[PDB]
Design an enzyme around this catalytic site. Structure first.
Site, PDB file in Angstrom:
ATOM      1  N   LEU A  61       0.844  -1.192   0.000  1.00  0.00           N
ATOM      2  CA  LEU A  61       0.000   0.000   0.000  1.00  0.00           C
ATOM      3  C   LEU A  61       0.883   1.248   0.000  1.00  0.00           C
ATOM      4  CD1 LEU A  61      -1.911  -1.306   3.101  1.00  0.00           C
ATOM      5  CD2 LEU A  61      -2.597  -1.784   0.754  1.00  0.00           C
ATOM      6  N   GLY A  62       1.580   1.468   1.109  1.00  0.00           N
ATOM      7  CA  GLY A  62       2.453   2.619   1.220  1.00  0.00           C
ATOM      8  C   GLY A  62       3.901   2.206   1.380  1.00  0.00           C
ATOM      9  N   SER A  63       4.747   3.157   1.769  1.00  0.00           N
ATOM     10  CA  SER A  63       6.171   2.880   1.955  1.00  0.00           C
ATOM     11  C   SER A  63       6.882   4.076   2.601  1.00  0.00           C
ATOM     12  CB  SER A  63       6.826   2.564   0.612  1.00  0.00           C
ATOM     13  OG  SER A  63       5.935   1.876  -0.254  1.00  0.00           O
ATOM     14  N   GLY A  64       8.118   4.320   2.166  1.00  0.00           N
ATOM     15  CA  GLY A  64       8.894   5.428   2.690  1.00  0.00           C
ATOM     16  C   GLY A  64       8.882   5.475   4.205  1.00  0.00           C
ATOM     17  N   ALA A  65       9.691   6.370   4.769  1.00  0.00           N
ATOM     18  CA  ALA A  65       9.789   6.532   6.220  1.00  0.00           C
ATOM     19  C   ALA A  65      10.543   5.367   6.859  1.00  0.00           C
ATOM     20  CB  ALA A  65       8.388   6.658   6.835  1.00  0.00           C
ATOM     21  N   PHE A  66      10.106   4.971   8.050  1.00  0.00           N
ATOM     22  CA  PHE A  66      10.737   3.871   8.770  1.00  0.00           C
ATOM     23  C   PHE A  66      10.628   2.566   7.989  1.00  0.00           C
ATOM     24  CE2 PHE A  66      10.634   5.957  13.154  1.00  0.00           C
ATOM     25  CZ  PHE A  66      10.409   7.205  12.609  1.00  0.00           C
ATOM     26  N   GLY A  67       9.400   2.088   7.812  1.00  0.00           N
ATOM     27  CA  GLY A  67       9.160   0.854   7.087  1.00  0.00           C
ATOM     28  C   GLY A  67       8.064   0.994   6.049  1.00  0.00           C
ATOM     29  N   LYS A 125       3.665  -3.365   8.751  1.00  0.00           N
ATOM     30  CA  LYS A 125       4.840  -2.518   8.579  1.00  0.00           C
ATOM     31  C   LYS A 125       6.099  -3.286   8.999  1.00  0.00           C
ATOM     32  CE  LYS A 125       5.849   2.217   9.881  1.00  0.00           C
ATOM     33  NZ  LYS A 125       5.048   3.400  10.302  1.00  0.00           N
ATOM     34  N   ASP A 138       6.525  12.872  13.383  1.00  0.00           N
ATOM     35  CA  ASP A 138       6.193  12.799  11.965  1.00  0.00           C
ATOM     36  C   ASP A 138       4.689  12.903  11.741  1.00  0.00           C
ATOM     37  OD1 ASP A 138       7.898  10.839   9.392  1.00  0.00           O
ATOM     38  OD2 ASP A 138       6.571  12.581   9.240  1.00  0.00           O
ATOM     39  N   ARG A 169       0.000  11.970   4.837  1.00  0.00           N
ATOM     40  CA  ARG A 169       0.368  10.593   4.506  1.00  0.00           C
ATOM     41  C   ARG A 169       0.380   9.732   5.768  1.00  0.00           C
ATOM     42  NH1 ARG A 169       5.689  11.042   6.295  1.00  0.00           N
ATOM     43  NH2 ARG A 169       5.991  13.295   6.692  1.00  0.00           N
ATOM     44  N   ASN A 170       0.459  10.385   6.921  1.00  0.00           N
ATOM     45  CA  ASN A 170       0.476   9.683   8.199  1.00  0.00           C
ATOM     46  C   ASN A 170      -0.846   9.868   8.934  1.00  0.00           C
ATOM     47  OD1 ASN A 170       4.015   9.856   9.034  1.00  0.00           O
ATOM     48  ND2 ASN A 170       2.739   8.148   8.347  1.00  0.00           N
ATOM     49  N   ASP A 172       1.173   6.257  12.736  1.00  0.00           N
ATOM     50  CA  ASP A 172       2.581   6.508  12.866  1.00  0.00           C
ATOM     51  C   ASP A 172       2.912   7.596  13.863  1.00  0.00           C
ATOM     52  OD1 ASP A 172       3.086   4.544  10.856  1.00  0.00           O
ATOM     53  OD2 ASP A 172       2.572   6.057   9.359  1.00  0.00           O
TER      54      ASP A 172
HETATM   55  C1  LIG Z   1      -0.949   6.536   2.054  1.00  0.00           C
HETATM   56  C2  LIG Z   1      -0.982   5.070   1.628  1.00  0.00           C
HETATM   57  C3  LIG Z   1      -1.972   4.285   2.485  1.00  0.00           C
HETATM   58  O1  LIG Z   1      -3.180   4.487   2.395  1.00  0.00           O
HETATM   59  N1  LIG Z   1      -1.426   3.402   3.312  1.00  0.00           N
HETATM   60  C4  LIG Z   1      -2.204   2.677   4.104  1.00  0.00           C
HETATM   61  C5  LIG Z   1      -1.870   2.516   5.442  1.00  0.00           C
HETATM   62  C6  LIG Z   1      -2.684   1.757   6.273  1.00  0.00           C
HETATM   63  C7  LIG Z   1      -2.356   1.589   7.609  1.00  0.00           C
HETATM   64  N2  LIG Z   1      -1.262   2.154   8.112  1.00  0.00           N
HETATM   65  C8  LIG Z   1      -0.568   1.574   9.088  1.00  0.00           C
HETATM   66  C9  LIG Z   1      -0.045   2.355  10.111  1.00  0.00           C
HETATM   67  C10 LIG Z   1       0.685   1.765  11.134  1.00  0.00           C
HETATM   68  C11 LIG Z   1       0.892   0.393  11.137  1.00  0.00           C
HETATM   69  O2  LIG Z   1       1.606  -0.183  12.138  1.00  0.00           O
HETATM   70  C12 LIG Z   1       2.321   0.766  12.800  1.00  0.00           C
HETATM   71  C13 LIG Z   1       1.601   1.786  13.683  1.00  0.00           C
HETATM   72  C14 LIG Z   1       0.227   1.697  13.859  1.00  0.00           C
HETATM   73  C15 LIG Z   1      -0.415   2.627  14.661  1.00  0.00           C
HETATM   74  C16 LIG Z   1       0.337   3.619  15.264  1.00  0.00           C
HETATM   75  C17 LIG Z   1       1.709   3.658  15.051  1.00  0.00           C
HETATM   76  N3  LIG Z   1       2.299   2.761  14.282  1.00  0.00           N
HETATM   77  C18 LIG Z   1       0.373  -0.389  10.116  1.00  0.00           C
HETATM   78 CL1  LIG Z   1       0.639  -2.099  10.127  1.00  0.00          CL
HETATM   79  C19 LIG Z   1      -0.356   0.201   9.091  1.00  0.00           C
HETATM   80  C20 LIG Z   1      -3.194   0.829   8.405  1.00  0.00           C
HETATM   81  C21 LIG Z   1      -2.890   0.634   9.788  1.00  0.00           C
HETATM   82  N4  LIG Z   1      -2.649   0.478  10.889  1.00  0.00           N
HETATM   83  C22 LIG Z   1      -4.328   0.255   7.847  1.00  0.00           C
HETATM   84  N5  LIG Z   1      -4.619   0.429   6.568  1.00  0.00           N
HETATM   85  C23 LIG Z   1      -3.832   1.160   5.768  1.00  0.00           C
HETATM   86  C24 LIG Z   1      -4.167   1.324   4.429  1.00  0.00           C
HETATM   87  C25 LIG Z   1      -3.353   2.084   3.599  1.00  0.00           C
HETATM   88  O3  LIG Z   1      -3.673   2.245   2.288  1.00  0.00           O
HETATM   89  C26 LIG Z   1      -4.872   1.522   1.996  1.00  0.00           C
HETATM   90  C27 LIG Z   1      -5.146   1.603   0.495  1.00  0.00           C
HETATM   91  C28 LIG Z   1       0.259   7.215   1.412  1.00  0.00           C
HETATM   92  N6  LIG Z   1       1.321   6.217   1.227  1.00  0.00           N
HETATM   93  C29 LIG Z   1       2.635   6.868   1.301  1.00  0.00           C
HETATM   94  C30 LIG Z   1       1.218   5.203   2.285  1.00  0.00           C
END
Ligand SMILES: *[C@@H](CC(=O)Nc1cc2c(Nc3ccc(OCc4ccccn4)c(Cl)c3)c(C#N)cnc2cc1OCC)CN(C)C
Length: 270
Positions: free
Chosen positions: A19-25, A46, A137, A141-142, A155
């Site tokens: 789905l996403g990238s960049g940053a830490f993981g 992640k 951060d 995007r976060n 994040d």
């Molecule tokens: C946006 C792209 C985008 O939409 N990416 C995502 C991301 C998610 C996430 N994100 C996410 C965040 C944290 C995660 O773990 C670490 C964490 C959680 C909470 C607090 C601190 N650290 C994980 Cl495993 C994922 C989640 C969640 N949680 C769920 N669904 C997502 C969907 C998604 O896209 C869906 C299409 C711009 N790009 C650069 C990423």
């Protein structure tokens, strides 16, 4: 302790896409299948590449700190996979990211769906500030979208190459991050929000920044966004931290605007 954090094993899921990238993981839309139980549950992931390792455990002591958050605008950690690489899994928010998403629909978006998002994100930190937890951060995007009406802050607390175009002066100058450094990351996150996701400084060199600011520059006013609003984006970009506006003051001001955006965010749509 035995918080609400569920420790899983590599035998409970299997990424499916990126789905996403960049940053830490990075992150993928894997598939969680609780062991012993049945229920093809969807979830992200992640695989933080590295950090510094200053024991291989603390990575946990924080997780629980990530699992404690009691806010409807601050994503909470589900479980975690500890091994050769730490895997962060959580509920999959099918909607994109405040960042892309928006971008996607700059057309019929809304003066309200935003004049809140700013209240939802600001309301998200006001809690992090009350918990001595620093994000480090903050960007569209976060920020996930559990609905075009309910956004949350992802994040954060992780750090525990850099978003120069977001950080503040000190953080950029003297790697200093505080409940005041974010107020700067926020007023910006919104800007990209008002200008429907738009790489701030499109062109300038991350380096030339420390200066461009040293004299308050660039970061024009998001066409749409009116005046009084900008003063919010700018007032947040003050060189004197103790000058910025604590979120507690940012939530009360944004709530005063949302109750009548049609007059605060001009748009040639509806
Ligand atoms: C946006 C792209 C985008 O939409 N990416 C995502 C991301 C998610 C996430 N994100 C996410 C965040 C944290 C995660 O773990 C670490 C964490 C959680 C909470 C607090 C601190 N650290 C994980 Cl495993 C994922 C989640 C969640 N949680 C769920 N669904 C997502 C969907 C998604 O896209 C869906 C299409 C711009 N790009 C650069 C990423």
């Amino acid at each position: 302790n035995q918080a609400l954090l569920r420790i899983l094993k590599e035998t409970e899921f299997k990424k499916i896409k990126v789905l996403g990238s960049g940053a830490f993981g990075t992150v993928y839309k894997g598939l969680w299948i609780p062991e012993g139980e049945k229920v093809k549950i969807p979830v992200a992931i992640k695989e933080l590449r590295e950090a510094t390792s200053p024991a291989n455990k603390e990575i946990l002591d924080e997780a629980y700190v990530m699992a404690s958050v009691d806010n409807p605008h601050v994503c909470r950690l589900l479980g975690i996979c500890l091994t050769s690489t730490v895997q962060l899994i959580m509920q999959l928010m099918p909607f994109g990211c405040l960042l892309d998403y928006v971008r996607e629909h700059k057309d019929n978006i809304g003066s309200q769906y935003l004049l809140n998002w700013c209240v939802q994100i600001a309301k998200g930190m006001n809690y992090l500030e009350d918990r001595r937890l620093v994000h480090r951060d903050l960007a569209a995007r976060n920020v996930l979208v559990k609905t075009p009406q309910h956004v949350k802050i992802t994040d954060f607390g992780l750090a525990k190459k850099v978003p120069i175009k977001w950080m503040a002066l000190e953080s950029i100058l003297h790697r200093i991050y505080t409940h005041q450094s974010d107020v700067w990351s926020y007023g910006v996150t919104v800007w990209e929000l008002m200008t429907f996701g738009s790489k701030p400084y499109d062109g300038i060199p991350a380096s030339e920044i420390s200066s461009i600011l040293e004299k308050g520059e660039r970061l024009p006013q998001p066409p749409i966004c009116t005046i009084d609003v900008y003063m919010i984006m700018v007032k947040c970009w003050m060189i004197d931290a103790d000058s910025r506006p604590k979120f507690r003051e940012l939530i009360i001001e944004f709530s005063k605007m949302a109750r009548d955006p049609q007059r605060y965010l001009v748009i040639q749509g509806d």
